[PDB]
Design a protein around this ligand. Structure first.
Ligand SMILES: Oc1ccc(Br)cc1
Ligand SMILES: Oc1ccc(Br)cc1
Ligand SMILES: Oc1ccc(Br)cc1
Ligand SMILES: Oc1ccc(Br)cc1
Ligand SMILES: Oc1ccc(Br)cc1
Ligand SMILES: Oc1ccc(Br)cc1
Ligand SMILES: Oc1ccc(Br)cc1
Ligand SMILES: Oc1ccc(Br)cc1
Ligand SMILES: Oc1ccc(Br)cc1
Ligand SMILES: Oc1ccc(Br)cc1
Ligand SMILES: [Cl-]
Ligand SMILES: [Fe+3]
Ligand SMILES: [Fe+3]
Ligand SMILES: [Fe+3]
Ligand SMILES: [Fe+3]
Lengths: 102, 83, 491, 305, 491, 305, 83, 102
């Protein structure tokens, strides 16, 4: 429960990307579109858990650049296996975020 | 053919022991409960009083007697108003 | 020269030995000791944090009593009985009745430890605890005794525990469960830790603040001096808890704490709740019941419990909701059925009080206020038959207090029932049902006042028959409205 | 119907007394509600473990009386007056300890007395704690609050004597650090022949759970033996060994013991209002006396050797 | 030019209207809708955070399937069936059997919402959810089908839900309670929020990591693509929860979440627990079951639940203790009674595995290890009669899984029993008993496999009779030790 | 005894088929386990609310057959092939929308056509969503997975049509912002006489809870009426008003509607293997047809006025 | 006079259905339970096996039969060793 | 529960002194014997709740000086109605303290 309390008391948000061609482009995009947030990456081979504190944005424009081919934001669904945080998504970007601070 | 029930009336603050009769209709059960609530702690209002097993969704039919209901003595009923 | 207590204290508790002519289990039977199979040797680690010695105890306690009695003697002519708001007088009547002979029963919890605890320090501290509770029983008989000649309701300081009156059965069912009806270790954890570090501060210090605001220094001085003893002997529980945890009994310890806190809570909600938010004059309300709960139970007790390595009880969120709600309903029931109390409940619902209630419990007027609106109308129109009951409340088979909920605009009430050995029981909360299921042999064949009424034990089966069964001896003893409905003149 | 009745000058249960109720009467009488309902002493399931314990070891005791509540402590002590009395006695004892220490009393006892103390005096902390535990048991089981109150004060007295013993054990060790004072008492209580009769007596007395047998074995057998065979012989030995502090300390402890004897005898007198109780009491005295006798004999031979 | 979805999306969910030819309650009956009396107008505020539109859905889903099927086709000759550790093969067998036809039952939970939810956005997102679960049912039949010709235990991908096999009854009793047997709003909260944002990540991503470590990319690729759908349709629950809280139904919402999480937990402990800590080869164990629980359920799900304004469940400390303990016992039972499973349990107790287990769950060898020590001795001495059962386990009347505890040095086991309408029920936890008491009409006349055995429904009353009742059709289908006890050679 | 049996080439339930099982057979057939136990469809108390709902509205339907599971979608669609087909159709529709918008098609419709669209076309989003809700209901109640799969795809098709309507409502409003396009459809559905027959029909169809009556009222009465009395007449009107996009869009929607008609007719053929079903089906058609007829009549008079 | 009980054996990991006889002594009950535990998952040991109602403190006497015990069918018992 | 969480998450320790001649001397002593700790005082007329963060010491010597008459540490029991924190007490002082930091 010390372990459990510490596990629960996080503000980590971000995409969990399944293995495939979106892993590195999303990590790169997370770094670029959240300047001055540290991005943490946990590699589980079948998926990668990418996080930041409180808010993590992915913009279509940056993702397209990092992926290296035409990309529409809805396409991320092909590779977005899960996510931490609440989600706000439109044609231009996706925001993972929390209302509260623990 | 006295039959004790525990009854919670809509908008009241407690559950009370109300002694009804084995052959009372749900309509008659409702009136006997209301005696101990309406105009004592609960404001009177228009509408039809219905009886259900405590916390139930299903209302008993108005004409159904307590003997026909399958209720056991000292079980808890709610008396509420149809929406 | 004299030698300091630190240099010889260890010898006063070097009293454990290895039995030879009887077995350890014969000398400390689990049913009376509650050692949970933990061997004697492990109990020598027990270290009471609040120590005293015999010569210090008698000297200090002599001083404590000389002050309590001196203040009482000096203030006899202050006209508390005649000049105080009658709701304050009802507070004294309820306190002495609910408490005096329960303090004396606590002698037995402490004696159970002094004989049957395997921890030598516990046996000695329990010996002082025996003496402390003797003090408290004797003080709280001596103090109200002078009022016998004024008011027969003061006879209940002595009489309550000898009766079947509903509140006296609720008190005895609780104290007999946590104090006198379990093994020494259960007493250490349920009584000295859970009850005496947790809840008694509400009644003996919380209420003391109100008493001081009310100008009753005899009483505030008395109950705060009593709590000075509690602060010492209550420190028997923590070391027992620490030892249980160290010896692989954390789960059993936690369950005992969780059960005792809940049982204590429902009783304080019925006694102290209505006192603090309704009987005490508005001008004398130092803090609301909820505010005092947050100071004493949440800020102080729960923080201590966490420091000792226990967890918040499973029902914590339930408890917090209950603090906002339960006692308003309990007050309403005690007032509506006032004739069955040995004190005079004050309604406490003048417009000025209702404004305070709304500030302290936002949403109050749309809930309990709805019921008080009907009651107030009846009183104003002199429909008095409608302000007295003609049936029994349904009663919890654990707390012995009626089954209540939230009334008015967002009406919600829930009864938690249980079949057990061909009998149907009803409880006022999930937690009370859970307490029963923890130890059904403690409770299964107990009958609450409603169960007895339905079984033919109360004859005649009428309000009057119930009152006689409950021990009332004259028309003057039955509870009435504290102000004889004078509060309606302000509505 | 409910009739009007006037306020009473005292509690309803005392309102018929001839004399004005005393402080003792007001605060001590008829406080065990657990005797009201024969079928469930306690307000719980009538077959709960502690209900069964109380129905067996209190209600069903062979020692019987229709009004145990009428018992009166001949000293009529209440908590307040007990502390006044004992604060005086303890202050006196503390003053003796202080002054005798100033005079270096312990240095001037007869050669070897420290060894007799280490063997015959300092292990008494065990015996005294047994009296304490046992007094607490009679308190919790006794069928009247006036009896239980005598037992509570007796429990406190037993702790008083334990505390005197602890203090003096430690103090003596300061003058005599090579006698095992404060180090070897448990070993002695557990293994030394002179202590074995005592330890056997108390382990068995502590397992007598019937309230009447508990009272009789403790107060009528064990405790008078301690006065006769332990307290007085030690005073005698102290006098032959130039220990002038021990006789004075024992005389204060003897005031306590004589008070315990007074309430015990008052209880016997009250119990013998029922003729059946004579045989019940006598038979328990005969059951316990040989253990007590062997206890005393082994101790005295240890003390006089 | 085309117009962006934001400019026309509102019109796709402007579908609520005021009924006139039937009443609102006839069109949305509470028993199927679960609107808790909240009027239609209030449901128009529902705002699904993970939107899509029909033309995007068909395009994207076309791509998702083209990849899943392409990878399967490309890896057909990789010899997974022949070359994988048999414990990995048993993992596939248990997954497809426990899951395929349950996915197809989830179509019905989503359909219940598409028809009966009063929230227009929920009805549309549930329509996509219907399609998603159709996908998942069809994928998880198509993928194992190729193995039918290799191994009859693969027939259970289709057969399990059609049988009375113990694990299939446990799965159906759970899915029928949370998915197909309650109103639309209960489905939103219990299925899409509690189960689909909480627990399914364990099986569809947690296990995927192990699958990738094991070199089974067909399977890891399949289950992670499936979870991409779940991530979308699972976002139906949060907005429903937010609305319930806003409309004064927080307590009802909280109770539904607390019940669904517990029910899901006991099932995952029996399926995923043994897979992660025992069946998966030691070298392929990306993290322990407990470590994955702390990542997905505690760090991710519980933190989300708090962000939405709900409270930690009452039984939180119980749950955490259960994570350290329950699945080790469940694994032991599944292995001991392996003949009643349609997969081959691996024991997973070679010395090297026991060292890992000890590191991941300190104290393991003194508890479960004590039982494995006896089993291991019997296997080594070829006392095989002692490694197969000759009676039934006692079974929980909620979870349909056996009643277990902690074995070995600090043995502790507790059954929580209940009388209800003249019948005795037994539960594996306080929480399972509580779930029953929350809604007894859902459960009261259900009979578990043991109840049926005692009632004469299973004939003959023998191990063989039980196996035939459970749907086994040939000797090859019954579970055996995965490695035919070859693991003992390492002991 | 348990005998040895060899692995099967397919699921045990299909192992006896003459022909090699197709993708359709493998992934679609006999998946409702809720039909296995007549006394408790679901693995719960046999008298739980949803067990009673299913025993009443599925098991006890007058429409009866001893092997509903044998039903086969004549199109044999699975999720995979449905998305391939519809991605093609939707891509085509999106390409039409894009190109017609480039040509400013909406600007060149006959004077006043925007008003006819606002009244007769844009409120169809309500009617289409009713078809969606209703299809979902037949899905969850149907007694074979092969029937339910037809209903799921039909539910998705109804949402497709709703989405076309939403998109085109919004788009048209951009050229014609003063016709209440995207603003007044609910008011029209609720109060406009031409919509009232439709709204009355659907509110009642949505409350027909028997799976057989649900299927017959939806698929054999309501949906063929929509093709005859709504889709085709709108194409005709669009042609008289120089709307060349609407007829092309409706032709794509009609491919969906004709597929729903095909599986519906296959189900009727399968059901009529039981002679009792002819009277059951006919009587439901006669019960529902007048509501459908009045629906169509009011709509057409609204459309042609 | 088959009598089903649910039995938890000391140090074992589960509770099992064990069918005993109405006239079995507690000694005989204990042996029938042990058959399904000792040397399967529980190591054999010296001492006397005793029977109690599940979670109880009170042991039934060894010679007491199940019929004399007042146990009902399908109640839970523990089988443990005297300390 | 936001209110309750904040109530629980305190590290306040210290004596609760009943009305009488020890109130001001104990407040003064708390200030003197804990230099560089802020002392908080809540006056409830019948008692005063005196606290510091984490640890609060009262020494006999300072208390004697502030009270103005001979004083033995055990005498504080006459006026110590309750206390927050665990207690450690001897002839020379009393320490109120917590093991944990919340
Ligand atoms: O609008 C959306 C864009 C991308 C995702 Br992923 C989800 C929704
Ligand atoms: O006498 C009563 C006490 C409390 C309640 Br609530 C009801 C009646
Ligand atoms: O008949 C009765 C009415 C009220 C009570 Br309280 C008891 C009995
Ligand atoms: O708690 C109770 C209040 C009133 C009666 Br009457 C009985 C019990
Ligand atoms: O019990 C004792 C009394 C006084 C002193 Br000094 C020491 C001990
Ligand atoms: O078949 C079984 C499954 C789990 C347990 Br635990 C016991 C038996
Ligand atoms: O007789 C039986 C033995 C084991 C099981 Br599993 C079922 C029946
Ligand atoms: O969960 C269960 C495991 C084994 C049997 Br047999 C029955 C139920
Ligand atoms: O349903 C739609 C298909 C294509 C476009 Br562009 C818009 C809507
Ligand atoms: O040793 C102690 C000194 C003072 C107090 Br207050 C308590 C114990
Ligand atoms: Cl519970
Ligand atoms: Fe006290
Ligand atoms: Fe106390
Ligand atoms: Fe799925
Ligand atoms: Fe899903």
């Amino acid at each position: 429960s010390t372990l459990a309390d510490q596990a629960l008391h996080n503000n980590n948000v971000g995409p969990i990307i399944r293995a495939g061609d979106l892993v590195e482009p999303v990590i790169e995009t997370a770094e670029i579109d959240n300047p001055g947030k540290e991005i943490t990456v946990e590699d589980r081979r079948a998926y990668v858990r990418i996080a930041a504190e409180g808010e993590l944005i992915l913009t279509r424009k940056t993702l397209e650049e990092q992926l290296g081919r035409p990309f529409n934001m809805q396409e991320l669904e092909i590779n977005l296996a899960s996510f931490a945080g609440q989600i706000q998504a439109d044609e231009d970007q996706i925001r993972f975020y929390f209302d509260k601070t623990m | 053919s006295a039959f004790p029930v525990h009854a919670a009336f809509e908008k009241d603050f407690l559950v009370q022991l109300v002694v009804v009769d084995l052959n009372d209709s749900m309509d008659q059960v409702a009136e006997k409960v209301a005696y101990h609530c309406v105009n004592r702690r609960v404001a009177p209002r228009e509408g039809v009083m219905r009886v259900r097993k405590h916390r139930s969704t299903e209302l008993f039919p108005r004409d159904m007697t307590i003997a026909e209901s399958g209720l056991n003595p000292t079980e808890v009923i709610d008396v509420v108003f149809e929406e | 020269a004299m030698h300091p207590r630190k240099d010889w204290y260890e010898l006063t508790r070097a009293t454990n030995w290895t039995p030879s002519y009887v077995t350890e289990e014969q000398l400390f039977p689990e049913r009376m000791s509650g050692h949970m199979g933990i061997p004697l040797e492990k109990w020598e680690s027990y270290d009471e944090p609040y120590k005293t010695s015999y010569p210090e105890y008698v000297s200090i306690q002599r001083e404590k009593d000389a002050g309590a009695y001196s203040v009482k003697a000096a203030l006899e002519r202050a006209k508390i009985y005649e000049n105080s708001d009658p709701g304050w007088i009802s507070t004294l009547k309820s306190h002495y009745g609910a408490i005096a002979v329960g303090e004396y029963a606590a002698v037995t919890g402490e004696g159970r430890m002094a004989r049957f605890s395997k921890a030598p320090g516990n046996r000695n501290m329990a010996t002082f605890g025996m003496m402390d509770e003797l003090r408290h029983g004797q003080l709280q008989l001596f103090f109200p005794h002078e009022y016998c000649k004024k008011d027969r309701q003061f006879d209940w300081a002595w009489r309550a525990y000898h009766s079947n009156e509903w509140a006296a059965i609720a008190a005895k069912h609780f104290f007999d469960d946590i104090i006198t009806g379990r093994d020494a270790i259960s007493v250490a954890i349920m009584l000295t830790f859970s009850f005496e570090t947790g809840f008694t501060n509400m009644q003996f210090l919380g209420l003391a603040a109100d008493a001081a605001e009310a100008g009753d220094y005899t009483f505030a001085n008395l109950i705060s001096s009593i709590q000075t003893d509690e602060s010492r002997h209550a420190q028997q529980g923590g070391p027992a808890l620490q030892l249980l945890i160290e010896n692989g009994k954390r789960e059993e310890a936690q369950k005992k704490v969780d059960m005792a806190i809940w049982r204590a809570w429902r009783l304080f909600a019925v006694l102290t709740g209505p006192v603090m938010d309704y009987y005490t004059p508005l001008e004398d309300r130092s803090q609301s019941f909820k505010e005092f709960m947050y100071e004493w139970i949440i800020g102080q007790f729960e923080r201590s419990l966490i420091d000792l390595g226990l967890d918040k009880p499973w029902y914590w969120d339930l408890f917090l909701k209950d603090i906002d709600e339960l006692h308003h309903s309990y007050h309403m029931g005690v007032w509506y059925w006032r004739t069955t109390a040995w004190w005079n409940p004050a309604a406490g619902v003048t417009p000025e009080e209702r404004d305070w209630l709304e500030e302290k419990y936002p949403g109050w007027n749309k809930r309990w206020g709805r019921c008080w609106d009907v009651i107030t109308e009846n009183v104003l129109n002199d429909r008095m038959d409608l302000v007295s009951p003609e049936t029994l409340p349904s009663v919890c088979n654990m707390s012995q207090i009626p089954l209540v909920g939230v009334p008015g605009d967002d009406w919600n009430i829930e009864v938690f029932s249980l079949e057990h050995n061909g009998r149907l029981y009803h409880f006022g909360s999930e937690v009370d049902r859970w307490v029963f299921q923890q130890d059904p042999v403690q409770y299964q064949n107990h009958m609450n006042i409603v169960d007895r009424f339905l079984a033919g034990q109360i004859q005649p089966m009428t309000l009057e028959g119930a009152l006689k069964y409950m021990g009332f001896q004259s028309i003057e003893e039955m509870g009435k409205d504290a102000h004889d409905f004078a509060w309606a003149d302000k509505c | 119907s409910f009739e009007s009745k006037k306020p009473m000058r005292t509690w309803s249960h005392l309102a018929e007394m001839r004399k004005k109720p005393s402080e003792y009467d007001i605060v001590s009488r008829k406080l065990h509600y657990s005797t009201n309902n024969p079928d469930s002493p306690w307000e719980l399931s009538p077959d709960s473990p502690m209900n069964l314990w109380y129905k067996q070891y209190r209600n069903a005791s062979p020692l019987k009386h229709d009004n145990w509540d009428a018992f009166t402590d001949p000293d009529q002590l209440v908590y307040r007056t007990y502390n006044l009395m004992q604060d005086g006695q303890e202050s006196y004892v503390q003053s003796l300890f202080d002054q005798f220490n100033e005079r270096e009393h312990d240095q001037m006892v007869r050669e070897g007395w420290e060894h007799t103390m280490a063997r015959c005096y300092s292990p008494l902390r065990y015996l005294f704690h047994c009296l304490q535990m046992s007094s607490a048991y009679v308190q919790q089981m006794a069928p009247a609050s006036t009896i239980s109150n005598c037992c509570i004060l007796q429990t406190a007295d037993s702790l008083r004597w334990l505390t005197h013993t602890a203090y003096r054990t430690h103090e003596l060790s300061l003058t005599y650090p090579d006698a095992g004072l404060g180090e070897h008492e448990r070993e002695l209580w557990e293994k030394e022949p002179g202590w074995q009769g005592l330890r056997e007596l108390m382990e068995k007395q502590l397992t007598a759970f019937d309230w009447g047998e508990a009272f009789v074995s403790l107060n009528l057998v064990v405790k008078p033996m301690i006065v006769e065979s332990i307290f007085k012989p030690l005073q005698q030995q102290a006098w032959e060994n130039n220990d002038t502090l021990l006789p004075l300390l024992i005389d204060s402890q003897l005031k306590d013991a004589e008070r315990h004897s007074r309430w015990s005898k008052a209880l016997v007198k009250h119990a013998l209002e029922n003729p059946d109780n004579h045989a019940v009491i006598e038979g328990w005295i005969e059951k316990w006396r040989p253990l007590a006798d062997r206890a005393a004999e082994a101790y005295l031979s240890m003390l006089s050797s």
